[PDB]
Paper text:
Introducing a mutation in YeeD (L45A) strengthened the interaction, as found in binding experiments using purified YeeE and YeeD mutants (described later). The mutants E15A, V16A, C17A, D42A, Y43A, E48A, and R49A severely impaired StYeeD’s affinity for StYeeE, while the mutant L45A enhanced the affinity. This enhanced affinity could stabilize the crystal packing of StYeeE-StYeeD, leading to its higher-resolution structure. Therefore, in this paper, we introduce Mol A of the higher resolution structure, which shows the best electron density map, to explain YeeE and YeeD interactions. The cytoplasmic indentation of StYeeE associates with StYeeD, which consists of 2 α-helices and 4 β-sheets. While the important, conserved residues C293, C91, and C22, termed the first, second, and third cysteines, respectively, are arranged perpendicular to the membrane at 8.6- and 6.7-Å intervals, C17 of StYeeD, one of the YeeE-interacting residues, is the putative enzymatic active site and is located adjacent to C22 of StYeeE as the “fourth cysteine. The distance between the third and the fourth cysteines, 10.8 Å, is wider than that between the other cysteines, and this space may be needed for transient binding of the thiosulfate ion rather than its transport. A water molecule is located at position III, a predicted thiosulfate-binding site. The relay of a thiosulfate ion from position III to C17 is likely facilitated by the conserved positively charged residues R28 and R98. In the 2.60-Å structure of StYeeE-StYeeD, the electron density is faint on the N-terminal side of the CPxP motif, raising the possibility that some electrons may be attracted to the CPxP motif.
Author numbering:
A (entry chain B): 1 to 329, 374 to 450
B (entry chain A): 1 to 329, 372 to 450
Write the structure that this text describes.
């Protein structure tokens, strides 16, 4: 049973890698650049999961298990996890799958993420988690077809409604907005509509299989990394979530390689390793304090209508916003080289290069992250210019050619 | 008492950084390049430590505590630790102080070193350590002024001699060879003679203070990294050796910064991270299997005349050699420039040598480096080729331009 985590994690990783599904980017870019592509993906997926999780519970394939409510932990830990997201150059699922893509910064961030989460759970930061534990809400639900006994409060349970009703109302609202609203364009072939459907299916598969293996929950990140570290350092057995992490990495790597997008990568400046290192530590403290991360709380907990998960997600986003302001703000006439610069940067340095350019000029942009080669084309068409061709130099490296137009 | 580890480690770290004392380089370059500078440093320090450890035991400031003999562990672990050295681009002390010099590769290699050693002591590789433990030799010494009760066999104990006698004989032979033999030349101002005296003084100080904190041993590395990880991950208290590691890093960092040699650094090719990560893991498994590392066994154990330490050191060197073969088999006109910034030492020296030979008479050679050891080795490699170094200028902090005029 436990070995189904490797399979679910493998599929999870392919979807994350092919879709460029980075929630840290989704929260950040909806503030910095009014980009909602990844936010539409998130909302549509949450909507599908809302319908799927209650449907799968109805027919007896799983029970929902909302995480307990803890206002101090969910808020403070949520917020601190939001800060670390931006510093580490991605949320925990994003860091995890970028490991298999070949980014050494993500190797660094995952190490400090795992160690910091381990340390907050049972080591040098245990005292903090103990202090936060006193503020846990005693509110719980009773065993039913929908809920594991003793789980945390939901929108349904507070309202006294069958979980089907808020699930359908909220999802329909989510879908109305996702579809009745304009979305930022991207060149991703694995587009946000079909990625949402795949991601939710993988989500349901994970809740089912993980439950059979004795972990009554769907996809998560933080507990998988702690299960792996416990295994290596204490010889404890691996569990479903530990194997899911392995699967994510392996799946993202396979998917990157087959797409010719795998490449061992380094940042432009060495100090980034210090940044993503501190960032990963903040994430480990935040996630453990909060009781879950971008996946455990947001992708998996929100569609269960868990109050803890809605609350922690609000502060995931506010922390992301705080840290994002702290950190941010063929002839060939000019050449900009943004290889190894953090995923916001290539789009920003290519926008500023097209603006600070004369008409008819041909600009070369050098990138080595595939998310940017599907974002810069749209930023270019909304500036008057047009992309001539995206040519692959090395594997995992692409040259973008732009003809400026007024 | 435990806090004296930070002090001793801080001093230990300064001496390593200033002297460029990297034993992995010491073993490798004596085979690759017939370079014996760092090996005279090691041999002289060992000699000074042999006299010092016994003298300090005589007057009651410490007792020696030779590590136990284990042929399977000391040989196989020593050899595996040898392979890891070269892959990680530095031994365990070299990786540790390079963390303070700002090498992100050292950060990486330390992480996998600490985790691999922890996993070998009590995690997923403990099965191997258990299997090795069955071969432990029951040989041991009795409590005396010289020895902790139950410590492992020494040259003295096997010979039935007062520890002073093999100590003075072997050290005198070491000092004869060190001073009666030519040594490879270097530009290091903290030269191998004055560095050996300081290193041995710091070594003795560590043996004294650590013993007062309840760890009857001198300088080590692997235990401190495990003590650190245990504290962070399980909330256990830090001991003298964990604080010694912290000291080492702080010490090298201050020393590098004051010398204007500190710089956050990246390797030339990203795969180096995979390399040094695997290397650090090999070191963790090897050091724990061997019962000690370049410091715990070689620097601290050999002067105690501990059979375990002499034996494991033999295979540290054999493993280093094996891996060394697998792996290594201003206005100035400037005719050609070689940029070896971020390339792993021996490479700057190697690519600078090849560049001078593959060049025409009178050509001006610009070598770009960013590791401070290389700027004291390349000058001698150049003079033994006929050419001469015009000037070594500082480009960035931690970065140097070497200008070579090629003759004939
Ligand atoms: C296992 C061989 C390769 C190990 C490379 C470790 C490098 C350092 C990374 C640490 C965190 C993740 C470590 C995950 C390693 C697998 C988990 C493990 O050791 O499992 C033990 C098992 O559960 C007992 O029954
Ligand atoms: C804590 C971690 C536990 C362990 C997790 C391990 C998961 C599996 C690894 C995936 C990486 C995949 C590597 C893919 C390498 C691709 C190489 C490539 O694409 O080479 C191109 C070249 O140009 C020739 O065509
Ligand atoms: C040869 C290298 C250069 C010269 C280096 C000289 C260093 C000092 C010499 C010490 C050896 C003394 C040996 C004899 C000591 C007296 C006899 C003795 O102690 O005998 C013990 C007995 O055999 C059992 O307990
Ligand atoms: C108390 C009894 C035991 C003492 C134990 C420790 C002894 C250390 C010194 C040994 C002799 C060293 C002689 C070295 C003389 C110099 C080297 C030499 O002869 O030639 C080189 C040249 O003359 C100059 O650099
Ligand atoms: C009784 C034992 C024997 C006596 C032990 C005495 C204490 C140890 C040495 C202290 C400082 C040594 C470091 C100094 C090394 C040379 C420094 C130097 O040359 O610095 C000048 C300038 O700042 C750059 O060129
Ligand atoms: C107290 C503040 C600690 C900040 C840690 C940031 C670095 C985290 C990296 C982990 C790998 C290196 C492990 C060494 C960690 C030493 C610090 C530590 O927590 O030691 C245990 C503590 O002293 C027991 O009470
Ligand atoms: C987590 C494992 C244990 C970690 C233990 C850490 C102990 C303190 C050492 C830090 C590095 C060295 C000190 C920092 C040196 C900074 C030098 C610097 O910034 O130099 C500026 C430059 O010279 C232009 O002005
Ligand atoms: C244990 C060491 C640290 C591990 C940290 C997490 C690793 C996660 C997976 C990465 C794929 C690694 C293998 C795939 C890449 C191989 C290198 C490559 O593609 O090229 C190498 C070149 O051919 C010759 O140097
Ligand atoms: C370990 C790293 C932590 C990093 C982050 C530190 C943030 C600031 C600290 C605390 C805020 C506490 C906020 C809540 C405090 C009041 C809770 C409360 O109600 O206290 C009274 C109680 O209900 C009846 O005694
Ligand atoms: C149970 C969930 C039902 C969800 C129904 C969503 C319908 C979306 C269509 C909108 C029309 C305008 C599109 C522009
Ligand atoms: C329950 C209702 C839904 C059931 C079905 C859910 C699973 C869909 C299956 C595969 C994903 C396909 C991803 C879309 C892109 C496929 C590839 C493509 O469009 O072109 C590739 C190109 O030709 C170069 O390989
Ligand atoms: C049952 C799983 C799939 C449910 C959703 C399938 C349809 C969503 C996609 C596109 C609609 C048209 C967009 C214009
Ligand atoms: C029981 C249900 C199990 C889960 C079923 C849902 C599908 C999971 C896998 C999707 C892979 C999608 C791969 C998409 C690759 C797109 C190709 C691309 O982007 O090429 C450029
Ligand atoms: C788990 C190991 C996953 C990675 C296994 C592949 C490592 C070898 C590799 O990447 O080979 C690339 C090749 O050398 C390019 O020509
Ligand atoms: C260590 C033993 C296991 C080794 C690992 C074997 C994993 C299974 C292999 C392939 C299935 C998944 C295929 C994933 C395809 C990703 C999407 C993709 O890139 O599709 C091609 C497209 O043409 C690009 O544009
Ligand atoms: C609400 C409690 C917040 C507690 C945590 C605040 C962290 C602030 C930022 C540190 C990053 C520094 C990065 C330095 C990189 C050089
Ligand atoms: C096993 C892991 C061990 C620990 C691994 C982490 C590193 C520890 C050492 C030094 C940190 C501080 C180094 C100095 C920080 C400033 C350096 C500098 O000059 O920064 C310039 C930059 O542009 C400004 O943003
Ligand atoms: C974790 C693995 C570490 C790497 C291990 C690689 C070497 C394999 C060991 C063979 C030892 C045989 C030694 C002889 C056995 C004892 C002889 C006897 O039985 O007496
Ligand atoms: C009683 C116990 C005493 C124990 C401690 C004994 C002395 C240790 C020396 C440390 C500083 C070394 C200074 C290094 C000088 C650097 C000079 C240099 O390279 O200048 C450029
Ligand atoms: C870790 C303890 C030492 C931390 C030192 C940080 C120094 C620093 O901020 O770097 C220098 C400065 O930023 C640029 O002039
Ligand atoms: C916070 C903790 C701060 C600790 C600072 C304490 C002592 C520094 C003294 C040792 C400095 C290392 C000397 C290295 C060196 O090079 O000194 C000679 C100089 O280069 C010739 O110009
Ligand atoms: C007694 C038992 C002895 C043996 C026990 C331990 C076995 C490990 C052996 C060799 C590892 C060789 C180094 C492998 C490094 C990984 C590949 C890599 O990093 O590839 C790129 C690199 O640059 C290419 O040289
Ligand atoms: C230092 C002793 C530590 C403990 C034992 C570890 C193994 C020693 C290595 C070889 C044994 C034979 C040594 C024979 C004496 C001369 C050695 C020699 O020539 O030194 C190397 C180099 O050639 C100079 O240029
Ligand atoms: C049976 C032995 C198997 C292991 C491998 C041999 C042991 C180490 C050899 C080093 C010589 C390196 C090659 C020559 C370098 C000359 C400089």
């Amino acid at each position: 049973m436990i070995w189904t985590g490797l399979l679910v994690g493998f599929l999870f990783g392919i979807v994350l890698q092919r879709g460029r599904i980075a929630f840290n980017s989704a929260f950040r870019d909806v503030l910095l650049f009014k980009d909602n592509y990844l936010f539409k993906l998130a909302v549509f997926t949450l909507a599908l999961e809302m319908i799927l999780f209650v449907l799968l519970s109805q027919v007896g394939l799983m029970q929902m298990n909302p995480k307990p409510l803890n206002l101090v932990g969910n808020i403070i830990g949520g917020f601190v996890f939001g800060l670390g997201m931006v510093l580490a150059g991605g949320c925990a699922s994003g860091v995890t799958y970028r490991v298999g893509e070949g980014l050494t910064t993500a190797w660094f961030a995952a190490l400090f993420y795992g160690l910091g989460a381990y340390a907050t759970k049972s080591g040098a930061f245990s005292w903090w988690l103990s202090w936060v534990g006193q503020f846990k809400s005693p509110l719980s639900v009773e065993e039913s077809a929908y809920y594991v006994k003793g789980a945390g409060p939901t929108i349904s349970s507070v309202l006294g409604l069958n979980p089907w009703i808020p699930a359908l109302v909220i999802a329909a609202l989510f879908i109305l907005w996702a579809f009745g609203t304009k979305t930022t364009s991207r060149e991703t072939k694995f587009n946000w509509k079909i990625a949402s459907v795949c991601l939710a299916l993988v989500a349901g598969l994970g809740f089912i299989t993980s439950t059979l293996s004795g972990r009554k929950y769907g996809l998560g990140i933080t507990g998988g990394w702690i299960n792996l570290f416990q295994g290596f350092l204490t010889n404890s057995p691996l569990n479903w979530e530990g194997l899911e992490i392995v699967g994510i990495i392996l799946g993202a790597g396979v998917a990157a390689a087959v797409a010719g997008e795998f490449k061992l990568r380094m940042p432009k400046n060495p100090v980034t390793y210090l940044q993503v290192g501190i960032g990963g530590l903040l994430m480990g403290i935040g996630a453990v304090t909060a009781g879950g991360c971008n996946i455990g709380h947001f992708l998996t907990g929100v569609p269960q209508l868990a109050l803890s998960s809605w609350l922690a997600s609000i502060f995931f986003i506010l922390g992301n916003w705080t840290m994002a302001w702290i950190l941010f703000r063929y002839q060939v006439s000019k050449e900009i080289d943004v290889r190894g610069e953090v995923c916001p940067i290539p789009d920003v340095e290519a926008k500023r290069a097209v603006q600070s350019a004369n008409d008819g000029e041909i600009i070369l942009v050098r990138i080595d992250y595939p998310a940017s080669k599907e974002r810069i084309p749209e930023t270019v068409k909304k500036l008057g210019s047009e992309v001539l061709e995206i040519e692959e130099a090395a594997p995992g490296e692409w040259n973008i050619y732009i003809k400026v137009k007024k």
